[PDB]
Curated annotation (Swiss-Prot):
Record PANTHER family: RAS, DI-RAS, AND RHEB FAMILY MEMBERS OF SMALL GTPASE SUPERFAMILY
GO biological process: adipose tissue development; animal organ morphogenesis; cell surface receptor signaling pathway; cellular response to gamma radiation; cellular senescence; chemotaxis; defense response to protozoan; endocytosis
Effect of residue 12 to D: In CSTLO; severe mutation
Membrane topology type: Lipid-anchor
Gene expressing this chain: HRAS
Name under which the protein is recorded: GTPase HRas
Phenotypic consequence of residue 17 to N: Dominant negative. Prevents PLCE1 EGF-induced recruitment to plasma membrane. No effect on subcellular location of isoform 2
Pfam families in the cross-refs: Ras
């Protein structure tokens, strides 16, 4: 069956792991344990196609980011995650996209911009600001909450649909 290799990237603490764990394991991780590099695999049906999602959950903390570039190389699509209550994480997105372009050696890589923690009211990144950034990259913007599950499946499935357009 078709395997989609997805890679989740973004600043430390934005919720990359919580999103992936919610998708794969159907619970919310409340604590914060920084990731090195973890992978998850699950067979799912997306738009009538039985397929395997192979998801690489990467480090956002510089201290743990050792060989992230080598892990990212085989990725077919990238979820670029920031948190809507973390302006710095949003500003960091451009640099993650630059890293993606570097490791794929392409200016045309399947990606989705994800604004996570949308259950929180301490918003400093407005939807329109993120929409504009995504538009400049030619990709969709989707807001999510790993806590409530809002948009979680939608974000990952959208990324699959982006890979399918390439
Ligand atoms: N309210 C709320 N908290 C969230 C959400 N997603 C993650 N968190 C919280 O934010 C913290 C960090 O989440 P985590 O998934 O570990 O972040 P990360 O991006 O994987 N971090 P790292 O890059 O260090 O591995 C945790 O306390 C987690 O519960 C969300 O959608 N809403
Ligand atoms: Ca929990
Ligand atoms: Ca390269
Ligand atoms: Mg494949
Ligand atoms: Mg993590
Ligand atoms: Mg503002």
């Amino acid at each position: 069956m078709t395997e989609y290799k997805l890679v989740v990237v973004g600043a430390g603490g934005v919720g990359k792991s919580a999103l992936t764990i919610q998708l794969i394991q159907n619970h919310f991780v409340d604590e914060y344990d920084p990731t090195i590099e973890d992978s998850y695999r699950k067979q799912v049906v997306i738009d009538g196609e039985t397929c395997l999602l192979d998801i690489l959950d990467t480090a956002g903390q510089e201290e743990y980011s050792a060989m992230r570039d080598e892990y990212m190389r085989t990725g077919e699509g990238f979820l670029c995650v920031f948190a809507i209550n973390n302006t710095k994480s949003f500003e960091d997105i451009h640099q993650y996209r630059e890293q993606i372009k570097r490791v794929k050696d392409s200016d045309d890589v399947p990606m989705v911009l994800v604004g996570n923690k949308c259950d929180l009211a301490a918003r400093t990144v407005e939807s329109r600001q993120a929409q504009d950034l995504a538009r400049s990259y030619g990709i969709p913007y989707i807001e999510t909450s790993a806590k409530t599950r809002q948009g979680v499946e939608d974000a990952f499935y959208t990324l699959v649909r982006e890979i399918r357009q390439h």
